[PDB]
Amino acid sequence: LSTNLISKISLLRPSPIVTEQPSAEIREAYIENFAKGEHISAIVPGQSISGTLELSAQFRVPRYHSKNSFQQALQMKAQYYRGLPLYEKNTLLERLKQLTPNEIKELEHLHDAVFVNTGLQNVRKVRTKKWKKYWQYKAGIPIGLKRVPNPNFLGNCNIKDFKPPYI
Amino acid sequence: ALYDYYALQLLPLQKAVRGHVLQFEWHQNSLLTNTHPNFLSKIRNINVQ
Amino acid sequence: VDSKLLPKNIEPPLTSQYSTRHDAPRGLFPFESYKPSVQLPDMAKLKKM
Amino acid sequence: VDSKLLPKNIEPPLTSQYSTRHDAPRGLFPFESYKPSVQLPDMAKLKKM
């Protein structure tokens, strides 16, 4: 009980995201007739996530040339908004007073290649955010983390932990 | 010496696991022909068949 | 381009850090008796005498 | 895939967890517990050694 011993006694001993058929009775009736080899009335798709990757009904190749700015050039022998930073009024104007219509067709495709890459990057990010919630939903996790349990339940195994004799 | 005493505290529990693990290692040596070496398995003499 | 924004495979995620139990057969582990004594033996009577 | 539940085990004695005694024979577990010999000349020998 003395404080020379109390400090040493404890020292010596320390002691809307999927696109399946959500009805859980038409999927079973589909397989019950599919094993026979029969169609059914309703439709059933495979499971997936929602969302459409719709290109070419979106950002197009721009039209930097006029209706005849190439054939007339043929006769006369010639920070970011989406992916490109907005240029100042005076600095870009002398830059576009330098170029030639041999490079206008280059510039159109360069700017289209920037636009399509940004429009694929953001949709790719949204798609990864959707698949990370698909895989959690299909594995029993809710999101973002009389019943009878089967032996394949978390904590309901049949192989009980056997204890060693010294314990 | 506090941690010597820690090594002098948990030594025979270590020997207890050193005995049970060795006992199970001896259990691995079960072959049933090291034991009774006469295990008579199966014979049959010459039949008329 | 920053990493994790690079395109990655759409696959089932990794189950590497999962804890598995084992179905061991009937005669694999030996029968164990004699619980070992973890406690150190006391020799107060020997040094008292 | 098709797992089943083991129903219930009516356990006989000595076939159970914590069914081990100090009085049990150590067939295996080769470490021994030895009898202290208290003889007075052997007491003097132990005091000298």
mmCIF file of C-alpha atoms in Angstrom:
data_model
loop_
_atom_site.group_PDB
_atom_site.id
_atom_site.type_symbol
_atom_site.label_atom_id
_atom_site.label_comp_id
_atom_site.label_asym_id
_atom_site.label_seq_id
_atom_site.Cartn_x
_atom_site.Cartn_y
_atom_site.Cartn_z
ATOM 1 C CA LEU A 1 0.000 0.000 0.000
ATOM 2 C CA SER A 2 3.044 2.238 0.393
ATOM 3 C CA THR A 3 3.623 4.501 -2.608
ATOM 4 C CA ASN A 4 7.121 3.106 -3.156
ATOM 5 C CA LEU A 5 5.393 -0.207 -3.909
ATOM 6 C CA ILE A 6 2.200 1.008 -5.613
ATOM 7 C CA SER A 7 4.192 2.456 -8.525
ATOM 8 C CA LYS A 8 6.031 -0.863 -8.945
ATOM 9 C CA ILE A 9 3.183 -3.365 -8.437
ATOM 10 C CA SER A 10 1.394 -2.308 -11.617
ATOM 11 C CA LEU A 11 4.826 -2.065 -13.272
ATOM 12 C CA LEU A 12 5.808 -5.684 -12.572
ATOM 13 C CA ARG A 13 2.360 -6.911 -13.664
ATOM 14 C CA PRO A 14 0.335 -4.577 -15.933
ATOM 15 C CA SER A 15 -2.963 -6.324 -15.083
ATOM 16 C CA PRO A 16 -31.678 4.402 -58.470
ATOM 17 C CA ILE A 17 -28.148 3.064 -58.962
ATOM 18 C CA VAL A 18 -28.929 -0.209 -60.757
ATOM 19 C CA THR A 19 -30.881 -1.035 -63.926
ATOM 20 C CA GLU A 20 -32.021 -4.591 -63.275
ATOM 21 C CA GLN A 21 -35.590 -5.871 -63.077
ATOM 22 C CA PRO A 22 -36.386 -4.788 -59.490
ATOM 23 C CA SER A 23 -39.325 -7.192 -59.091
ATOM 24 C CA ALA A 24 -38.019 -10.236 -57.197
ATOM 25 C CA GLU A 25 -40.693 -12.533 -58.661
ATOM 26 C CA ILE A 26 -40.337 -11.962 -62.412
ATOM 27 C CA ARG A 27 -36.595 -12.737 -62.309
ATOM 28 C CA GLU A 28 -37.386 -16.108 -60.726
ATOM 29 C CA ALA A 29 -40.224 -16.879 -63.157
ATOM 30 C CA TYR A 30 -37.861 -15.967 -66.003
ATOM 31 C CA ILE A 31 -35.378 -18.647 -64.925
ATOM 32 C CA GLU A 32 -38.139 -21.168 -64.123
ATOM 33 C CA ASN A 33 -39.264 -20.962 -67.765
ATOM 34 C CA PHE A 34 -35.765 -20.409 -69.173
ATOM 35 C CA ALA A 35 -34.711 -23.869 -67.993
ATOM 36 C CA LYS A 36 -37.671 -25.213 -69.957
ATOM 37 C CA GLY A 37 -36.763 -22.919 -72.843
ATOM 38 C CA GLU A 38 -39.707 -20.519 -72.957
ATOM 39 C CA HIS A 39 -40.028 -16.773 -73.315
ATOM 40 C CA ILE A 40 -42.159 -14.729 -70.925
ATOM 41 C CA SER A 41 -44.373 -11.640 -71.146
ATOM 42 C CA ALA A 42 -42.261 -9.030 -69.349
ATOM 43 C CA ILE A 43 -38.674 -8.150 -70.225
ATOM 44 C CA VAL A 44 -35.578 -8.696 -68.074
ATOM 45 C CA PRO A 45 -32.176 -7.079 -68.698
ATOM 46 C CA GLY A 46 -28.892 -7.897 -67.078
ATOM 47 C CA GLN A 47 -27.894 -5.816 -64.097
ATOM 48 C CA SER A 48 -25.774 -2.703 -64.631
ATOM 49 C CA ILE A 49 -25.612 0.891 -63.463
ATOM 50 C CA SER A 50 -27.664 3.728 -64.930
ATOM 51 C CA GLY A 51 -26.226 6.481 -67.100
ATOM 52 C CA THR A 52 -25.588 6.888 -70.820
ATOM 53 C CA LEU A 53 -22.238 7.731 -72.401
ATOM 54 C CA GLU A 54 -23.633 9.781 -75.281
ATOM 55 C CA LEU A 55 -21.040 11.222 -77.634
ATOM 56 C CA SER A 56 -21.605 12.981 -81.010
ATOM 57 C CA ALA A 57 -24.917 14.273 -79.641
ATOM 58 C CA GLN A 58 -22.656 16.570 -77.617
ATOM 59 C CA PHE A 59 -19.502 18.619 -78.378
ATOM 60 C CA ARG A 60 -18.769 18.450 -82.106
ATOM 61 C CA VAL A 61 -15.765 19.308 -84.208
ATOM 62 C CA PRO A 62 -16.076 23.122 -84.367
ATOM 63 C CA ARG A 63 -16.486 25.110 -87.588
ATOM 64 C CA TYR A 64 -13.639 27.612 -87.643
ATOM 65 C CA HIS A 65 -13.774 27.862 -91.442
ATOM 66 C CA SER A 66 -16.501 29.609 -93.403
ATOM 67 C CA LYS A 67 -18.671 28.079 -96.118
ATOM 68 C CA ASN A 68 -16.015 28.880 -98.740
ATOM 69 C CA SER A 69 -12.947 29.814 -96.666
ATOM 70 C CA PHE A 70 -11.024 26.797 -97.989
ATOM 71 C CA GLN A 71 -11.734 26.923 -101.725
ATOM 72 C CA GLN A 72 -11.100 30.681 -101.793
ATOM 73 C CA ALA A 73 -7.886 30.005 -99.889
ATOM 74 C CA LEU A 74 -7.259 27.308 -102.499
ATOM 75 C CA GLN A 75 -7.656 29.901 -105.267
ATOM 76 C CA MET A 76 -5.515 32.552 -103.540
ATOM 77 C CA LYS A 77 -2.957 29.819 -102.598
ATOM 78 C CA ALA A 78 -3.055 29.880 -98.817
ATOM 79 C CA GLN A 79 -8.879 29.326 -65.868
ATOM 80 C CA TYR A 80 -10.228 26.940 -68.490
ATOM 81 C CA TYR A 81 -13.763 27.211 -69.841
ATOM 82 C CA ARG A 82 -14.014 23.578 -70.951
ATOM 83 C CA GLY A 83 -10.401 22.589 -71.538
ATOM 84 C CA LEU A 84 -8.845 25.780 -72.922
ATOM 85 C CA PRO A 85 -8.049 28.945 -70.953
ATOM 86 C CA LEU A 86 -9.830 32.117 -71.981
ATOM 87 C CA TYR A 87 -7.382 34.299 -73.888
ATOM 88 C CA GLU A 88 -7.265 38.083 -73.701
ATOM 89 C CA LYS A 89 -8.829 40.123 -76.493
ATOM 90 C CA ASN A 90 -5.656 41.695 -77.895
ATOM 91 C CA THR A 91 -3.113 38.893 -77.398
ATOM 92 C CA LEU A 92 -5.040 36.181 -79.253
ATOM 93 C CA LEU A 93 -6.026 38.479 -82.136
ATOM 94 C CA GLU A 94 -2.450 38.978 -83.329
ATOM 95 C CA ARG A 95 -1.896 35.236 -82.844
ATOM 96 C CA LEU A 96 -4.789 34.530 -85.218
ATOM 97 C CA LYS A 97 -3.381 37.206 -87.515
ATOM 98 C CA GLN A 98 -0.293 34.983 -87.843
ATOM 99 C CA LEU A 99 -1.680 31.573 -88.820
ATOM 100 C CA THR A 100 -2.479 30.179 -92.303
ATOM 101 C CA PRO A 101 -5.421 28.080 -93.597
ATOM 102 C CA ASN A 102 -3.060 25.105 -93.835
ATOM 103 C CA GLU A 103 -3.162 25.081 -90.015
ATOM 104 C CA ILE A 104 -6.850 25.920 -89.473
ATOM 105 C CA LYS A 105 -7.700 22.257 -90.080
ATOM 106 C CA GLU A 106 -5.008 21.387 -87.536
ATOM 107 C CA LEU A 107 -6.400 23.827 -84.947
ATOM 108 C CA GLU A 108 -10.004 22.600 -85.291
ATOM 109 C CA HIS A 109 -9.001 19.020 -84.538
ATOM 110 C CA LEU A 110 -6.685 20.090 -81.701
ATOM 111 C CA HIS A 111 -9.513 21.954 -79.967
ATOM 112 C CA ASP A 112 -11.913 19.065 -80.591
ATOM 113 C CA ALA A 113 -9.338 16.704 -79.069
ATOM 114 C CA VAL A 114 -9.251 18.907 -75.974
ATOM 115 C CA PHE A 115 -13.069 19.095 -75.747
ATOM 116 C CA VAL A 116 -13.667 15.345 -76.106
ATOM 117 C CA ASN A 117 -10.943 14.589 -73.551
ATOM 118 C CA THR A 118 -12.527 16.864 -70.937
ATOM 119 C CA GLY A 119 -16.009 15.522 -71.695
ATOM 120 C CA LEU A 120 -14.648 12.016 -71.218
ATOM 121 C CA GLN A 121 -12.697 12.866 -68.039
ATOM 122 C CA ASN A 122 -15.686 14.187 -66.087
ATOM 123 C CA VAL A 123 -17.988 11.352 -67.205
ATOM 124 C CA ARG A 124 -15.229 8.882 -66.273
ATOM 125 C CA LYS A 125 -15.106 10.394 -62.774
ATOM 126 C CA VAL A 126 -18.907 10.152 -62.412
ATOM 127 C CA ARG A 127 -18.788 6.565 -63.706
ATOM 128 C CA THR A 128 -16.169 5.566 -61.133
ATOM 129 C CA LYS A 129 -18.305 7.186 -58.417
ATOM 130 C CA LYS A 130 -21.226 5.041 -59.625
ATOM 131 C CA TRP A 131 -19.311 1.747 -59.848
ATOM 132 C CA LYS A 132 -17.895 2.191 -56.338
ATOM 133 C CA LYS A 133 -21.500 2.314 -55.078
ATOM 134 C CA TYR A 134 -22.575 -0.580 -57.312
ATOM 135 C CA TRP A 135 -19.973 -2.964 -55.893
ATOM 136 C CA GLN A 136 -20.852 -2.020 -52.316
ATOM 137 C CA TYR A 137 -24.567 -2.533 -52.985
ATOM 138 C CA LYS A 138 -24.067 -5.952 -54.573
ATOM 139 C CA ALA A 139 -21.948 -7.190 -51.636
ATOM 140 C CA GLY A 140 -24.280 -6.560 -48.685
ATOM 141 C CA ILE A 141 -22.727 -3.249 -47.592
ATOM 142 C CA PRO A 142 -25.525 -0.604 -47.448
ATOM 143 C CA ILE A 143 -23.661 2.369 -48.966
ATOM 144 C CA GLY A 144 -20.536 4.489 -48.497
ATOM 145 C CA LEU A 145 -18.992 2.628 -45.544
ATOM 146 C CA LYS A 146 -38.157 -14.846 -38.629
ATOM 147 C CA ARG A 147 -34.718 -14.863 -40.251
ATOM 148 C CA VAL A 148 -32.351 -17.815 -39.823
ATOM 149 C CA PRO A 149 -28.635 -17.272 -40.556
ATOM 150 C CA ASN A 150 -26.781 -19.589 -42.915
ATOM 151 C CA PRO A 151 -23.335 -20.962 -41.958
ATOM 152 C CA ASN A 152 -21.867 -18.467 -44.457
ATOM 153 C CA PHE A 153 -22.794 -15.559 -42.184
ATOM 154 C CA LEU A 154 -20.370 -13.066 -40.657
ATOM 155 C CA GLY A 155 -19.821 -14.626 -37.244
ATOM 156 C CA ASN A 156 -21.950 -17.771 -37.570
ATOM 157 C CA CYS A 157 -19.372 -20.344 -38.641
ATOM 158 C CA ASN A 158 -19.551 -24.013 -37.708
ATOM 159 C CA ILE A 159 -15.810 -24.251 -36.991
ATOM 160 C CA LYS A 160 -15.713 -23.166 -33.359
ATOM 161 C CA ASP A 161 -12.479 -21.744 -31.948
ATOM 162 C CA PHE A 162 -10.803 -24.493 -29.928
ATOM 163 C CA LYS A 163 -8.872 -23.266 -26.915
ATOM 164 C CA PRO A 164 -5.342 -24.384 -25.953
ATOM 165 C CA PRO A 165 -4.910 -26.253 -22.644
ATOM 166 C CA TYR A 166 -2.846 -23.529 -20.951
ATOM 167 C CA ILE A 167 -5.672 -21.026 -21.524
ATOM 168 C CA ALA B 1 15.951 -5.985 -15.426
ATOM 169 C CA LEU B 2 12.311 -4.865 -15.627
ATOM 170 C CA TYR B 3 12.205 -6.487 -19.038
ATOM 171 C CA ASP B 4 14.382 -9.349 -17.830
ATOM 172 C CA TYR B 5 11.605 -9.819 -15.293
ATOM 173 C CA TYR B 6 9.170 -9.577 -18.197
ATOM 174 C CA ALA B 7 11.139 -12.415 -19.770
ATOM 175 C CA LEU B 8 11.228 -14.015 -16.318
ATOM 176 C CA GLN B 9 7.417 -13.639 -16.117
ATOM 177 C CA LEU B 10 6.071 -15.355 -19.256
ATOM 178 C CA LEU B 11 8.653 -18.147 -19.716
ATOM 179 C CA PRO B 12 6.677 -21.287 -18.633
ATOM 180 C CA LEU B 13 3.617 -20.240 -20.645
ATOM 181 C CA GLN B 14 6.053 -20.178 -23.566
ATOM 182 C CA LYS B 15 7.155 -23.663 -22.496
ATOM 183 C CA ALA B 16 3.489 -24.736 -22.352
ATOM 184 C CA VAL B 17 2.970 -23.690 -25.964
ATOM 185 C CA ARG B 18 6.391 -25.255 -26.705
ATOM 186 C CA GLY B 19 5.006 -28.490 -25.328
ATOM 187 C CA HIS B 20 1.595 -28.477 -27.000
ATOM 188 C CA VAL B 21 3.002 -27.437 -30.385
ATOM 189 C CA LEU B 22 5.634 -30.169 -30.043
ATOM 190 C CA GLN B 23 2.863 -32.601 -29.070
ATOM 191 C CA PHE B 24 0.943 -31.679 -32.211
ATOM 192 C CA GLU B 25 4.186 -31.978 -34.195
ATOM 193 C CA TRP B 26 4.461 -35.478 -32.763
ATOM 194 C CA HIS B 27 0.840 -35.967 -33.826
ATOM 195 C CA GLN B 28 1.965 -35.105 -37.365
ATOM 196 C CA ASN B 29 4.282 -38.146 -37.143
ATOM 197 C CA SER B 30 1.294 -40.507 -36.956
ATOM 198 C CA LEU B 31 1.687 -43.027 -39.782
ATOM 199 C CA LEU B 32 0.106 -46.241 -38.306
ATOM 200 C CA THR B 33 3.072 -48.281 -39.551
ATOM 201 C CA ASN B 34 5.535 -46.757 -37.109
ATOM 202 C CA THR B 35 3.096 -47.955 -34.413
ATOM 203 C CA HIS B 36 2.000 -51.628 -34.549
ATOM 204 C CA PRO B 37 4.353 -52.937 -37.329
ATOM 205 C CA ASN B 38 2.196 -56.093 -37.820
ATOM 206 C CA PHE B 39 -0.907 -54.299 -39.094
ATOM 207 C CA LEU B 40 -2.129 -57.337 -41.005
ATOM 208 C CA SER B 41 -3.985 -55.741 -43.902
ATOM 209 C CA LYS B 42 -5.543 -58.352 -46.235
ATOM 210 C CA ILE B 43 -4.495 -61.720 -47.685
ATOM 211 C CA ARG B 44 -6.158 -64.508 -49.641
ATOM 212 C CA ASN B 45 -4.754 -67.943 -50.404
ATOM 213 C CA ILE B 46 -5.044 -69.854 -53.666
ATOM 214 C CA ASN B 47 -8.678 -70.468 -54.551
ATOM 215 C CA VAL B 48 -10.243 -72.926 -56.940
ATOM 216 C CA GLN B 49 -11.530 -69.831 -58.769
ATOM 217 C CA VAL C 1 -2.559 13.980 -64.941
ATOM 218 C CA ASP C 2 -3.160 13.189 -61.278
ATOM 219 C CA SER C 3 -3.265 9.551 -60.220
ATOM 220 C CA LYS C 4 -6.654 7.956 -59.349
ATOM 221 C CA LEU C 5 -7.994 10.039 -62.279
ATOM 222 C CA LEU C 6 -6.241 7.683 -64.694
ATOM 223 C CA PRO C 7 -8.626 5.074 -66.142
ATOM 224 C CA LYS C 8 -8.791 1.898 -64.096
ATOM 225 C CA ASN C 9 -10.273 -1.541 -64.649
ATOM 226 C CA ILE C 10 -13.887 -2.217 -63.707
ATOM 227 C CA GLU C 11 -13.340 -5.357 -61.632
ATOM 228 C CA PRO C 12 -14.497 -6.811 -58.330
ATOM 229 C CA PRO C 13 -12.403 -5.143 -55.627
ATOM 230 C CA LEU C 14 -9.618 -6.861 -53.744
ATOM 231 C CA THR C 15 -10.352 -9.493 -51.102
ATOM 232 C CA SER C 16 -6.733 -9.883 -50.017
ATOM 233 C CA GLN C 17 -7.151 -8.768 -46.388
ATOM 234 C CA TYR C 18 -9.848 -11.318 -45.542
ATOM 235 C CA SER C 19 -9.717 -13.721 -42.603
ATOM 236 C CA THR C 20 -10.218 -17.386 -43.487
ATOM 237 C CA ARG C 21 -10.913 -20.385 -41.281
ATOM 238 C CA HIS C 22 -9.878 -23.914 -42.199
ATOM 239 C CA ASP C 23 -11.705 -27.239 -42.374
ATOM 240 C CA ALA C 24 -9.192 -29.560 -40.777
ATOM 241 C CA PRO C 25 -9.935 -33.318 -40.858
ATOM 242 C CA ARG C 26 -10.707 -35.501 -37.858
ATOM 243 C CA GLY C 27 -7.334 -36.988 -36.991
ATOM 244 C CA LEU C 28 -5.100 -34.011 -37.704
ATOM 245 C CA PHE C 29 -4.650 -32.589 -34.212
ATOM 246 C CA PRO C 30 -3.733 -34.828 -31.261
ATOM 247 C CA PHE C 31 -5.714 -35.307 -28.096
ATOM 248 C CA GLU C 32 -4.353 -33.011 -25.405
ATOM 249 C CA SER C 33 -4.521 -33.584 -21.663
ATOM 250 C CA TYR C 34 -2.447 -32.204 -18.753
ATOM 251 C CA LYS C 35 -3.175 -28.462 -18.619
ATOM 252 C CA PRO C 36 0.304 -26.823 -18.236
ATOM 253 C CA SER C 37 0.910 -24.733 -15.066
ATOM 254 C CA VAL C 38 1.724 -21.136 -16.202
ATOM 255 C CA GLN C 39 2.401 -20.095 -12.552
ATOM 256 C CA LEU C 40 6.008 -20.420 -11.300
ATOM 257 C CA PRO C 41 6.598 -22.990 -8.535
ATOM 258 C CA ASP C 42 7.225 -21.551 -5.099
ATOM 259 C CA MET C 43 10.195 -22.645 -2.992
ATOM 260 C CA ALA C 44 9.393 -20.906 0.295
ATOM 261 C CA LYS C 45 9.504 -24.114 2.351
ATOM 262 C CA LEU C 46 12.885 -25.201 0.972
ATOM 263 C CA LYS C 47 14.567 -21.882 1.731
ATOM 264 C CA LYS C 48 12.713 -21.645 5.047
ATOM 265 C CA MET C 49 14.074 -25.030 6.155
ATOM 266 C CA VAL D 1 -22.267 -23.033 -51.850
ATOM 267 C CA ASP D 2 -24.719 -25.210 -49.900
ATOM 268 C CA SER D 3 -23.645 -24.967 -46.271
ATOM 269 C CA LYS D 4 -25.325 -26.898 -43.470
ATOM 270 C CA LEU D 5 -25.508 -26.335 -39.722
ATOM 271 C CA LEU D 6 -24.142 -28.825 -37.218
ATOM 272 C CA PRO D 7 -27.120 -29.169 -34.830
ATOM 273 C CA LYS D 8 -25.922 -29.761 -31.260
ATOM 274 C CA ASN D 9 -23.175 -31.685 -29.477
ATOM 275 C CA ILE D 10 -24.044 -33.600 -26.325
ATOM 276 C CA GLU D 11 -20.506 -33.615 -24.970
ATOM 277 C CA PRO D 12 -19.211 -36.481 -22.801
ATOM 278 C CA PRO D 13 -16.688 -35.536 -20.091
ATOM 279 C CA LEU D 14 -13.012 -35.024 -21.128
ATOM 280 C CA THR D 15 -14.246 -34.166 -24.672
ATOM 281 C CA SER D 16 -14.790 -30.436 -24.184
ATOM 282 C CA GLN D 17 -12.986 -27.140 -24.086
ATOM 283 C CA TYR D 18 -11.218 -26.555 -20.735
ATOM 284 C CA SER D 19 -11.557 -30.306 -20.036
ATOM 285 C CA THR D 20 -7.957 -30.752 -18.883
ATOM 286 C CA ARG D 21 -6.605 -31.484 -15.420
ATOM 287 C CA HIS D 22 -3.254 -31.295 -13.652
ATOM 288 C CA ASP D 23 -3.873 -34.910 -12.588
ATOM 289 C CA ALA D 24 -3.874 -36.066 -16.216
ATOM 290 C CA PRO D 25 -0.931 -38.085 -17.553
ATOM 291 C CA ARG D 26 1.495 -36.279 -19.822
ATOM 292 C CA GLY D 27 2.056 -39.000 -22.404
ATOM 293 C CA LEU D 28 3.324 -36.368 -24.796
ATOM 294 C CA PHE D 29 4.147 -32.797 -23.596
ATOM 295 C CA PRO D 30 7.642 -34.000 -22.673
ATOM 296 C CA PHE D 31 8.345 -31.418 -19.933
ATOM 297 C CA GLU D 32 8.149 -33.039 -16.506
ATOM 298 C CA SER D 33 7.275 -31.945 -12.992
ATOM 299 C CA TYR D 34 9.759 -33.437 -10.562
ATOM 300 C CA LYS D 35 9.461 -34.528 -6.957
ATOM 301 C CA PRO D 36 11.529 -32.426 -4.522
ATOM 302 C CA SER D 37 13.713 -34.750 -2.457
ATOM 303 C CA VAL D 38 13.858 -33.413 1.089
ATOM 304 C CA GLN D 39 16.688 -35.327 2.746
ATOM 305 C CA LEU D 40 18.856 -33.587 5.335
ATOM 306 C CA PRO D 41 22.281 -34.528 3.852
ATOM 307 C CA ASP D 42 20.795 -33.586 0.488
ATOM 308 C CA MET D 43 19.599 -30.378 2.162
ATOM 309 C CA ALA D 44 23.215 -29.690 3.164
ATOM 310 C CA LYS D 45 24.338 -30.540 -0.381
ATOM 311 C CA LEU D 46 21.781 -28.119 -1.821
ATOM 312 C CA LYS D 47 22.905 -25.416 0.610
ATOM 313 C CA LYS D 48 26.529 -25.932 -0.422
ATOM 314 C CA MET D 49 25.959 -26.209 -4.189
#
